[PDB]
Amino acid sequence: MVVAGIDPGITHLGLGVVAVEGKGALKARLLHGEVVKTSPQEPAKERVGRIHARVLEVLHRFRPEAVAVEEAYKVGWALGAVLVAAFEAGVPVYAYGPMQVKQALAGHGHAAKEEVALMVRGILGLKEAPRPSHLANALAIALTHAFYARMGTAKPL
Template sequence: MGYGLVRAFDGGSSPGDFELVEYGALTTPAGEPLARRLLSLYSQLNALLDRFHPAEVVVEELFFNRNTTTAIAVGQARGVALLAAANHNLPVQEYTPLQVKQALAGYGRATKDQIQQMVKVLLDLDFIPKPDDAADALALAICHLRGRRFQNLLAEQTDY
């Protein structure tokens, strides 16, 4: 399970408006019983939330997957993330892969490589974050921060 922490400055509309705080992937021991693996994810997520004190949590919305086993595993890990956020009284926002692609590349059919390049550019990095799950988490964070910027602009327009 990937994670990424990003700060936005000046509304987060262009490169340099974002700051990478931390990213990585949470892993669990292969061969462990499922309950132990989920508990490990939960413990690792709680440790991250305790360490960084984010204001909110962003999670990828579950989408239809042809591989039922994969979909169930993703759903279980996602549930652990939602539980950890709720345990810390943090609001959770969810985005579909399509929304992330549109927010970062302006195109809903952007490739994984294109999204990773946009993460690199928007965070002003010399490299593409690895593993892919971590890059995906950073893309989700950027999507949320960009969306929040537009929500704030709309709110300003109605406050006249």
């Protein structure tokens, strides 16, 4: 299955797409990874508009079965743009918090972020852990969703 994962951020918005294998231990391939980077000088509408345009472009190009997002006002803006794109692309949205990601990929709710990042590197077969953290997070969220999707406990926002 093909999944877009998104990590709504301060000045970076992690956006990744993975294709996960249907059998065997959780295994996926990286199809796309980007970070939407915003500047202090550019106005709010451009920052949010670009996020929208990037997410919509990714959904249309990669046609994932699902969008997965990690879990305040301004972060809410970014997620707003993301939600609009998923609505226009006709793609269902699922939300997961830090603890669920840790549980799915590291096997305990209180695992360190480094443990999650090690598993994402493992599952995707990467040479190094995917940088930066917003991208690593977005891939983890994507893989978290695939994990719960397999066992049928996907959490739809």
